[PDB]
Design a binder for these strands. Structure first.
Ligand SMILES: [Mg+2]
Ligand SMILES: [Mg+2]
Ligand SMILES: [Mg+2]
Ligand SMILES: [Mg+2]
Ligand SMILES: [Mg+2]
Ligand SMILES: [Mg+2]
Ligand SMILES: [Mg+2]
Ligand SMILES: [Mg+2]
Ligand SMILES: [Mg+2]
Ligand SMILES: [Mg+2]
Ligand SMILES: [Mg+2]
Ligand SMILES: [Mg+2]
Ligand SMILES: [Mg+2]
Ligand SMILES: [Mg+2]
Ligand SMILES: [Mg+2]
Ligand SMILES: [Mg+2]
Ligand SMILES: [Mg+2]
Ligand SMILES: [Mg+2]
Ligand SMILES: [Mg+2]
Ligand SMILES: [Mg+2]
Ligand SMILES: [Mg+2]
Ligand SMILES: [Mg+2]
Ligand SMILES: [Mg+2]
Ligand SMILES: [Mg+2]
Ligand SMILES: [Mg+2]
Ligand SMILES: [Mg+2]
Ligand SMILES: [Mg+2]
Ligand SMILES: [Mg+2]
Ligand SMILES: [Mg+2]
Ligand SMILES: [Mg+2]
Ligand SMILES: [Mg+2]
Lengths: 152, 206, 113, 124, 243, 51, 97
RNA sequence: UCUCUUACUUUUAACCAGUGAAAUUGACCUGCCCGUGAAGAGGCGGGCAUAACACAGCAAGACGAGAAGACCCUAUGGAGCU
RNA sequence: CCUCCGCAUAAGCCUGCGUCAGAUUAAAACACUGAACUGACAAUUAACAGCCCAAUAUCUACAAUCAACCAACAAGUCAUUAUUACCCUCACUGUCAACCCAACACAGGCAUGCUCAUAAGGAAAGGUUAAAAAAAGUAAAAGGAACUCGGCAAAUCUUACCCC
RNA sequence: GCUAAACCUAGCCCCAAACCCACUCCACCUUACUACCAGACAACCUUAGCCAAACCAUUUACCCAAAUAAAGUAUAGGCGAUAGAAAUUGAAACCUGGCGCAAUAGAUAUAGUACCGCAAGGGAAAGAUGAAAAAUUAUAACCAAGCAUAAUAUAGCAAGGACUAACCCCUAUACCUUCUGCAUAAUGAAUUAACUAGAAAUAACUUUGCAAGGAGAGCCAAAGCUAAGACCCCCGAAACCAGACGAGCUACCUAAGAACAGCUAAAAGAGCACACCCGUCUAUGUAGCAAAAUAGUGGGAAGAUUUAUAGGUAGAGGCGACAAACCUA
């Protein structure tokens, strides 16, 4: 849990148990080539290695072997319209490696667009757009500038 | 999703989170505020969907259906009635498809219409003694109903199909709560069979 | 993103669940101990003369033999009454300016109509 | 001059300033003589997750479910729903006693049990 | 803008506002007494009208005090009605010379005193005027009980007065047993005194100390709602059953 | 001595009302014609009343 | 260039208002109301200049006397500064001495 | 170094392309000689001269430009030191 | 063709020439498209360095300089025991860059290790002509200080005297 | 016709009335925005000075109890500039306003942000269409300095007299200030737009009103009393005092570190000479690379040497191998 006060552990005291955790992680495709078991996440700043270990071994049952983290510095160079700096927020990314030789490759979520729904609210307007564009593009160079409307 | 607007922000016929609105009035801008009649939220009468009557403009007297209400400047747009013309698909080599686009009308210039005689009519918010509160015509003495309009969720309830990640109706309403003086923590800790035998020692708070 | 309303639906759903369970915990604490505000604290006044709600910090040794807690000063030390008066005068200036501008806006609205 | 406005983080000072600041992670041990970190397993959070095998409940609701008016839970409603049947029953039997209330769930002091409520021994 | 109240009434308004309002009334009266002290460093005029030379007309004359300053060593022990005099001095008692600043500190001694009421020997940093006042009052205890609060000018004298008045009001086993007739003799000797007990606790207390005392009186760890609600339930069910 | 130009605008209207809203444009016409009347080839030859 | 190009919106004034019609009513009351109130007691303004004309320095002296015990700190410092300067101006500088 | 300077290379410099300052500026349609004048004249008197316009050098003049002279004096103006 | 530079560490700054799109404008002292940019996206992963020691008494005279002679003065940079207590283990932060202080893309200032010219690292010339004046160099017939306040600059390598 | 001009409204000011605010979860006195360990140290202090006395040495209204009057009286005062009471009298409870401004004005404010300075602190500028921008249309043009459309024509404070014609003909020593005197080669000004400098008493004059009385208590009076009108500038010093901020440059010191190739080494606060520190002389540069540099030539370079890190000494002072040298250009 984050933004909660932790009960102080007197020596020989009970096990610190968190029940409804407050951590939300984002699996991210890497930006450089990574080996076949490296799985890069994106975690809040108040998370550690062993918290990510127990998080992935309790909820998703994913066998993790080693976990390494680093703190990413967000940029603080963008000037606003009144020359005050806009801070892009820092975050922490974590690279875990699977235990039993299992592999993972980042899927493709966008391919491949195949859809042609019945269109009233948008595609009827697009149909009128393309029909106007196909009808009225009958301009001619031999007329020289006279309007192509009059039957005369 | 939740952006705070500048304190003098003009409303501009578009959603405030659109891209054409950010093109019109960005954070860069400051201009004269349009002084508007303040109207309480109990005497506001017309809603989005009721038949109305334009009192003045290029076509006075015509009826129609309001399709959008803008409370922050007291605006309505009657559907395809008080229009002017603009081209949509616009390029440097071709632009046509001239479309009728509406113009906003103030609440002074728009009066309600009662269904029995189809005439412009003034309205009062006469409270009904049966508990509810509906509008009552002043001159004709007839109740004007609040018209049904498809809500902003975009979902019609009768044609709704439950997906895999939507729980059903008979499970969300089933009373499972047995209220007791235990906390959720020790309740689920005795539920899952977890046992702790050592105590929590004293801790000095200051 | 295909449908971004799902994210806000999940977020305020979980905030509703958090509010429900915190209502349950606060009802239990009120029935068993008769005290709200599960984080324990006290009204104190720090060096700058402001009145603050200091929350306790869950130590292990008592406060009279804490070397770090005995360096923080919860008192007034009377050269700050002048600056407290100046802060009060500035806040009164701001409130009077707001009410006078509201009077002016009402006058302009009644001028136009 | 220096950079006054942007906030003080771990990446700024000298070699002794780095590492002493941290980012706000709850520490889980102490340093001993040989510069070693010693981990204490009672100090690391143990995520207690329940089994979701036979669970029939989804993260969204159907729109066709009816709506309800909000009634926030208060201490009086919890008392009347939890304790008042039992106290009402053994007052009808005349064996209610105002001296001993602990059989109805009332605790005089919170020091005995594991999850004490006012100092909030439990985390979340 | 303007303040509604002047700046010198904010003390009394704070006294009426919050926890100071729930102080007992005699303590607030002893705060807002504001009497003048006895003259120490200046000779007061005889009458209120003083026929003067160079015109035989009677003029009204007041006696202005001296702004005397007490360092905290005067708060630790019994001084007189005196302290330091922060002032300025012309060089040879003529105004056509320089102006120099001069301090008159009193002469301090260390004398041991006895208290017949408290039965304890105190070592005090006393000055000569308190010795003269003790000789004029025939005893240390008579001097501390007789002289009002603005004349002691020390907090230790006020604590001595509070202890003496508590000992007088309680009729405590003061000296020891095996001589209660001596207790009765000393309690009879100081009998034109001894305010009742609940007013005797608040004599000579500064405002911060009385605020702490009143806060310690109403500490009152808040009651559980369980007892209140079972009281409500048993009262409602007795009202239904007796009907 | 730190100032630049303003007014970055564009001259191509687009399909902004379907980016999202709850107001659709009330048209008053259609795209073209439904099915073309093909005239007879000798209508000028049949320019009289009938044939 | 200073001049305005387009002429301004024409300012309409209602001479038969509530105020301008009833201007000066209950003035001149003490002559023909058998002297119960003085016409200086109709004046509604600051508490310190109510029926008192004064100079510029005299107004600030009267303002420090009647009101300055409940002013703001900045305004009290500015008033002390202004009275010091106006003393130094009126009694030392100037013509006609 | 000089009698007594000369040749060569580079930078600099002149022409073409691009970007593109600063001190200064009462207005100038802004010549010479003699005399005059607040005592040293392009602007006054008498003579002389005189189609207009750039480009590259020179520093005799514009009592040339940057510093309300640092030398001298005054102030019932300051300050250091003995 | 140049290298009197460069690679790292420390200090300092905080994303500040990686990819895509805009390059119509906007900074390039000129444009290409990119060190004087606009928006979006991704990186820096510890073993390298910080983050440290349970107490009570007690112990600690023979420098360093290859430490072996010799030889010193300014007299020196490093160590424990006895008793009690002590059985869990690898958490957190930094890791990018053409960069820091001088109003700047400033011939200025910047601590240590490494090869003392190189395996690193860079380009004095936007194009034409060979004007005057100016600056930096090369060479010069005969004389060799005759110039100048003064052998000031340059070239050779240079004696003796006086004052302080 | 380019640069350009113009907008009203955000707001703000002065009063009246009324006493005003401060924990959603977490963090915040250690290097604040840091979850977690044993010396507990702690506040109570005449303001001073500029200025006036034409200097200055006592002296010079600022002090926090409502008005008017007594009264500028008794009094104090290098009896002088000036300071200045008291006894006594009484002081009609309620109304949400402006002969206040409108982007160089009004609070500095769109803002205590950008930016400058280590630090205390200083501290700005600005927007303009529209009923509909989900109307990009064609209009709305017309006006300052600066330019283009459209360079010059012998001669002369730029003009006047004129003439058939602009020049050609006759006359004419720019403005303000300070000066006995300025065209003076004395000062100030490139131009345009906005902003930017006479505030008041006793006593007099005029006009009303009343009259031995005048005046809405107090005061004046041998034609006086009440009321009104009219009349007294701006910017600029070196300085003084009080409280804060600074030893990241430099002066000195403290804690623990680092560096000094090669040769001759006489043993050496030794010699030549690298790196390094300093800057004797010359030349370039002077709005420069640089608010102190570059190139050549130089002194020291195993010691009184140089230097990185942290800390300490602060202005009535610190420090100083005394240069009255340094203490953020
Ligand atoms: Mg001459
Ligand atoms: Mg001239
Ligand atoms: Mg000159
Ligand atoms: Mg001068
Ligand atoms: Mg003189
Ligand atoms: Mg003098
Ligand atoms: Mg002087
Ligand atoms: Mg001095
Ligand atoms: Mg690296
Ligand atoms: Mg510089
Ligand atoms: Mg190379
Ligand atoms: Mg080059
Ligand atoms: Mg060239
Ligand atoms: Mg020769
Ligand atoms: Mg010679
Ligand atoms: Mg030489
Ligand atoms: Mg003087
Ligand atoms: Mg402004
Ligand atoms: Mg013009
Ligand atoms: Mg002529
Ligand atoms: Mg003349
Ligand atoms: Mg003039
Ligand atoms: Mg003269
Ligand atoms: Mg001149
Ligand atoms: Mg002059
Ligand atoms: Mg000039
Ligand atoms: Mg230092
Ligand atoms: Mg040597
Ligand atoms: Mg010399
Ligand atoms: Mg040497
Ligand atoms: Mg000397």
């Amino acid at each position: 849990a984050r933004n909660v006060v932790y009960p102080l552990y007197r020596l020989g005291g009970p096990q610190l148990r968190v029940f409804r955790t407050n951590f939300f992680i984002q699996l991210v495709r890497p930006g450089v080539a990574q080996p076949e078991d490296t799985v890069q996440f994106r975690i809040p700043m108040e998370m550690t290695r062993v918290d990510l270990r127990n998080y992935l071994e309790g909820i998703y049952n994913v066998p993790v072997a080693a976990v390494r983290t680093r703190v990413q510095h967000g940029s603080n160079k963008r000037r606003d319209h009144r020359n005050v700096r806009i801070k892009k927020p820092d975050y922490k990314v974590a690279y875990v490696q699977l235990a039993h030789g299992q592999t993972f490759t980042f899927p493709d979520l966008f391919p491949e667009k195949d859809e042609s729904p019945e269109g009233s609210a948008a595609d009827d307007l697009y149909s009128m757009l393309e029909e106007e564009r196909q009808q009225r593009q009958s301009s001619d160079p031999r007329r020289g500038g006279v309007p192509s409307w009059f039957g005369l | 999703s939740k952006v705070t607007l500048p304190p003098h922000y003009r409303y501009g016929m578009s959603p405030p989170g659109s891209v054409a609105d950010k093109r019109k009035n960005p954070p860069w801008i400051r201009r004269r505020p349009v002084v508007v009649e303040p109207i309480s939220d109990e005497d506001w009468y017309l809603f989005c969907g009721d038949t109305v009557e334009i009192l003045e403009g290029k076509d006075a007297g015509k009826q129609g259906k309001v399709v959008q209400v803008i409370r922050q400047r007291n605006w309505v747009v009657v559907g395809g009635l008080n229009t002017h013309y603009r081209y949509i698909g616009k390029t440097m080599d071709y632009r046509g498809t001239m479309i009728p686009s509406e113009a906003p009308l103030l609440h002074r210039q728009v009066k309600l219409v009662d269904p029995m005689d189809r005439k412009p009519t003034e309205i009062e918010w006469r409270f009904t003694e049966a508990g509810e509160r509906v509008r009552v015509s002043t001159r004709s003495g007839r109740i004007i109903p609040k018209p049904e309009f498809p809500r902003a969720d975009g979902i019609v309830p009768e044609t709704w199909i439950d997906g895999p990640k939507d729980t059903s109706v008979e499970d969300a309403l089933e009373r499972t709560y047995v209220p007791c003086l235990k906390t959720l923590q020790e309740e689920v800790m005795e539920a899952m069979g977890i046992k702790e035998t050592r105590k929590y020692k004293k801790v000095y708070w200051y | 993103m295909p449908s971004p309303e799902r994210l806000d639906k999940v977020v305020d759903s979980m905030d509703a669940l958090d509010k429900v369970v915190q209502e349950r915990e606060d009802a239990l604490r009120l029935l068993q101990t008769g005290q709200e505000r599960a984080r324990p604290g006290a009204w104190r006044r720090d060096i700058f003369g402001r009145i603050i709600w200091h929350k306790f910090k869950q130590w292990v040794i008592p406060w009279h033999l804490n070397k770090r807690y005995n360096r923080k000063r919860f008192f007034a030390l009377p050269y700050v009454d002048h600056f407290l008066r100046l802060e009060r005068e500035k806040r009164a200036r701001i409130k009077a300016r707001k009410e006078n501008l509201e009077r002016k806006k009402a006058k302009i609205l009644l001028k136009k109509f | 001059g220096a950079d006054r406005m942007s906030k003080w983080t771990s990446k700024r000072g000298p070699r002794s300033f780095r590492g002493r600041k941290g980012r706000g992670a709850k520490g889980i041990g102490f340093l001993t003589s040989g510069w070693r970190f010693v981990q204490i397993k009672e100090m690391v959070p143990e995520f207690v997750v329940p089994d979701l095998t036979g669970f029939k409940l989804k993260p969204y609701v159907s729109y066709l479910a009816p709506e309800s008016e909000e009634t926030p839970l208060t201490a009086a409603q919890l008392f009347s729903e939890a304790v008042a049947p039992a106290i009402e029953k053994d007052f009808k039997d005349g064996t209610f006693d105002p001296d001993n209330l602990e059989k109805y769930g009332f605790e005089p002091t919170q020091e005995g049990k594991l999850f004490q409520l006012y100092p909030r021994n439990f985390l979340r | 803008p303007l303040h509604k109240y002047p700046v010198w009434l904010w003390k009394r308004l704070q006294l009426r506002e919050g926890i100071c309002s729930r102080l007992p009334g005699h303590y607030l009266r002893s705060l807002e007494e504001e009497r003048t002290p006895t003259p120490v460093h200046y000779r007061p005029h005889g009458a209120k009208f003083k026929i003067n030379p160079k015109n035989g007309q009677r003029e009204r004359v007041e006696d202005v005090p001296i702004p005397i300053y007490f360092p905290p060593e005067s708060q630790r022990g019994l001084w007189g009605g005196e302290g330091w005099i922060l002032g300025q001095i012309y060089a040879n008692n003529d105004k056509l010379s320089k102006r120099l600043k001069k301090v008159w500190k009193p002469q301090l001694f260390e004398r041991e005193f006895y208290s017949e009421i408290l039965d304890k020997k105190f070592t005090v940093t006393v000055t000569m005027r308190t010795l003269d006042l003790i000789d004029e009052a025939y005893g240390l205890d008579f001097y501390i009980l007789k002289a009002s609060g603005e004349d002691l000018c020390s907090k230790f004298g006020m604590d001595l007065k509070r202890g003496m008045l508590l000992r007088l009001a309680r009729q405590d086993p003061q000296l020891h047993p095996e001589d209660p007739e001596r207790r009765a003799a000393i309690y009879d000797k100081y009998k034109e005194f001894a305010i009742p007990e609940e007013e005797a606790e608040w004599v000579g207390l500064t405002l911060e100390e009385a605020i702490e005392k009143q806060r310690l009186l109403e500490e009152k760890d808040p009651v559980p709602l369980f007892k209140i609600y079972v009281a409500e339930l048993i009262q409602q069910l007795q009202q239904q059953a007796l009907s | 001595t730190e100032k630049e130009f303003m007014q970055h605008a564009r001259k191509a209207g687009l399909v902004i009302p379907p980016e999202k809203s709850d107001r659709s444009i009330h048209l008053a016409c259609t795209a073209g014609i439904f099915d073309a009347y093909v005239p007879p080839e000798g209508d000028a030859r049949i320019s009289s009343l009938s044939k | 260039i200073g001049i305005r190009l387009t002429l301004p919106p024409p300012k309409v004034v209602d001479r038969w208002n509530e105020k301008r019609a009833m201007f000066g009513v209950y003035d001149n009351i003490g002559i023909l109301g058998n002297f119960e109130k003085h016409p200086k007691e109709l004046i509604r303004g600051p508490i310190w200049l109510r029926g008192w004309k004064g100079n510029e320095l005299q107004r600030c002296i009267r303002k420090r006397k009647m009101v300055g015990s409940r002013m703001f700190a900045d305004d009290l410092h500015n008033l002390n500064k202004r009275i010091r300067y106006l003393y130094k101006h009126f009694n030392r500088h100037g013509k006609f001495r």
